[PDB]
């Protein structure tokens, strides 16, 4: 290898894990609730219709 | 040969090592950590940035 001080691409590969974490947190706690909007964390547009 | 006071051929091989002796402790040194600057006696612009 050429770089011992930073293994950059486990960065890379920890900074696109940490983004499908967020969405697989989304869907459990969305398929857990029942409504769809979850508490207002979307788009409240609706949310107060 | 022709004198025997001053052997100058083996003062130039001294220098020669004595030259090639700061590349080799550079490259200890360089080896040693990971750091490529390793506290710069080299260029400082890229220490700075």
Excluded: M, P
């Amino acid at each position: 290898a050429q770089v011992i001080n930073t293994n950059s691409l486990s960065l890379i590969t920890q900074n696109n894990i940490n983004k499908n974490q967020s969405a697989l947190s989304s869907s459990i706690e969305r398929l857990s609730s029942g409504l769809r909007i979850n508490s207002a964390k979307d788009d409240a547009a609706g949310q107060a219709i």
